Assembly symmetry: D3
């Protein structure tokens, strides 16, 4: 398993404090040789922002990869025609992002990265994480699972008694999922037992 | 009919000046003993906002219930794991909110309240109010009507000659709809003749 | 209201013994001057069939109109290119027929009549009658209601306490629905109170 | 766990030789006290049929339960208004039956049993078994999983390397799934590891 | 072809620098006699904005038509009950706008113009322009194409080898598409060969 | 372009007399070296059938290929686990077959061949031919176009003035479409101008 020479986009959705489960996977991809471009859902700074106010997570991304963080539509768009990715990852993918992605809405820098990658016939790999995955998001998920060029990090119910509709990916399986996606395949078993 | 001990969330969507049809129903729930938490789609104040600039509707909510208005994602999220509602109401539910809700988008404090309530298997009760309900919103509405744990305040065409696609709930039926939802039932007749 | 010169197809779906609610409407159309062609879902005779074995309903159709009953795909198909209808009615339209029609299946003579009429941009008017209309059929119904050239005989819940998902058309409104459909309009109010 | 006094319908879909995985579960329900009515997708005899020609599976059903096999639309229909079930099971539910059920088609005695049970607000429990469950059937499955009164026998991928889209229920979990469905609940974990 | 007396709304979605393909068509409508109201997706000025900072495109709209630019929900809403359009155009319609429109979301001034026009039974004409039109947006597009009162400027693949999912309208066909829409018809051929 | 060693299934749907447009393409595949198995939607003989009663089309298939015609579910099923195809073609694919296929119904030998091929991750290539393709079938078509392992023989409107919703494949492009499908690609341009 070797991503030398590969340009992988890594988009993060949802609350900043849930990224401790995926940043170690971003770090593994860089260690396996990938050039990793981070994508995020909002601007990382306002005119207003002061010296050491930036949350830890941004600093952590900057310690993993020197690729500029894509945090605007303008910055995301060239990943279609100019600087194409070999693969785009979205992890964690929240319920809101899942239903936007599944319904062809593309109103965040992350979803624009995904759209720009799909434009070229290249793979998008998603790590779901939502408590409505077996409820209102079920059709969205299964729509994506069946769609050309879209692949899922293996997933399962994380707490069936307390959150019976919740599905969450095994983030440790991310590199393997990318490796199979780059060959045009869904990595298997896609359904796993979480913890 | 008695809601003593019950924690009901009451989310408002759409223009602030359409809430005169639902605030009297919020007031009835409090009078019937419910603890009512209001949810709204945007922040109720900016840094900028001055003394008596706040619109009447906010003041009116504050006269009905002392529960803090949930006007942010941060404030809405604990209604899943920490402070669960027995029922969430969304009334009025606009066409835009209807199609976001039906498609699993959860990008407002109101929709997060609904998602957090559905996470726990608890009921959400909606009062539709849109002029495209029998047009592009029809599938969204019927999707929701058939979905586990989602119930509709009885509704009908409010002006068939002038707005032939428009459906609006009879807001006076809200408490009865909550009472049936808390038993796992859709209150009937769900189709009524408006005015 | 005058259908002189108009060629209206009248398809019947579901059990033969439910047609007592629509045959009087077929008779009114003929009395208002329409040329009415009946369409049915299966062959009206097998090689096997004997003299007075044919059910009353067939005889009743034959007393209303002398147009040959279209009971096969071969017989239905020319209503596209050769003998086009000005309007096709499907009443009663069962839940099974509703979900086939809504999903573009066309495997009965009735649905082929509808397809052949839609091919030409001409109206199809449906009278629903199913106990799952507000359940699994809801999306199918609302899909059809929003689709070009498809119109609904006004309908409502026929027994909300006992069959809460059931919607049935007011068959007496059929001619009026045809009249509005021929002008490109849905007759209003489309939602009525049944009995 | 006790089904004394309960009338459970048990519909079988697909090839006759796949019923060896569900007949032992039909037998457990009878042993736990249920009155079990079998439903099947076609007529069990033609005029033509001879003495010992009937396949073993029919004989096996007849050894488990003395309730007449419902093998026609006429026989299935009274399970709505006259002889209502407390629960309807469909197991195995093939891909074809899954997509008919999910799309509101009701053109077999089994699907009519399910429709007649849903008419009354009563539960239907399904055991999927199709090699396209994570492909074209994915949306159908997730639609059903989210729909009022429909519940799934826990399921999983039965051979991810060879049939990566295949999901099959753990049929041994059927009684437990019925028990939770009768209380209005999906039995959990709904996602399991097959064999 | 003459639009004298006609009030046509012209909404623009997506990047400001893609409007050079549609402004000449806005200009033709005014030259053919239409009163053209522009609709845009965001506010055209902030408190902050300075003298000659406004992008060329705004100035260009202002040279074509003196109707105030509708750039807010408040400004768009009266096009339902007070100042109804005879037709609303959305061109270019981006992938994001397409999937919002198709899913009944109405959270921009442009989509509110479209909703307000559909409320009245009046036509909306769309010019698609997205690189995912034959991918994730395909169902949205075909949903709209089949929906009452919605019509498409003829379109085709603009670069099948490089962007195989991309569909873009022939903007030169816009007036003809409006003319047919005003008669209740889709202008044909709707599928063309781009450049 | 060489199909030596390749096992291609060729399913025919719709009226027997429309196969003159695809049998020459079946013949080209055999001439290019493919082993071609025909699939059809019904049994090719009844007990009843007499000597020279069989329609010309059957004889014509038998002159092109000696592979037994798969005309039953029993015969189609082994193309999953025992005798897998490298590709399955469905041409012509009627509107009825399109909406069954798109909705995961698998109730004909042709659709079972397609299901059995998709089970293995292998390509299915479809040639649409229906007068409702841009109407009620639009979502079905676009669903299939976006689905893993499904590819379309290039298609277009065959008579936009007379049948404005009609799409039909250019059957001459079938081999090229198979060649690209076997590499995991949709052959381009997929949208063409018919005749």
């Amino acid at each position: 398993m070797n991503f030398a020479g590969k340009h992988v986009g890594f988009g993060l959705t949802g609350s900043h404090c849930t990224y401790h489960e995926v940043l170690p996977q971003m770090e593994r991809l860089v260690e396996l040789g990938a050039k990793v471009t981070p994508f995020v859902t909002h601007t990382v700074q306002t005119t207003d922002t002061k010296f050491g106010e930036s949350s830890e997570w941004i600093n952590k991304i900057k310690q993993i990869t020197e690729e500029p963080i894509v945090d605007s539509m303008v910055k995301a768009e060239p990943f279609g025609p100019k600087t194409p990715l070999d693969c785009m990852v979205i992890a964690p993918m929240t319920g809101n992002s899942t239903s936007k992605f599944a319904n062809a809405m593309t109103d965040s820098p992350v979803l624009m990265g995904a759209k720009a990658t799909l434009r070229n016939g290249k793979p998008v790999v998603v790590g779901i994480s939502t408590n409505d995955a077996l409820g209102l998001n079920g059709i969205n998920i299964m729509r994506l699972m069946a769609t050309k060029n879209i692949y899922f990090i293996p997933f399962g119910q994380d707490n069936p008694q307390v959150k019976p509709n919740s599905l969450v990916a095994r983030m440790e399986a991310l590199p393997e999922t990318i490796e199979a996606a780059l060959r045009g395949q869904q990595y298997q078993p896609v359904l796993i037992e979480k913890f």
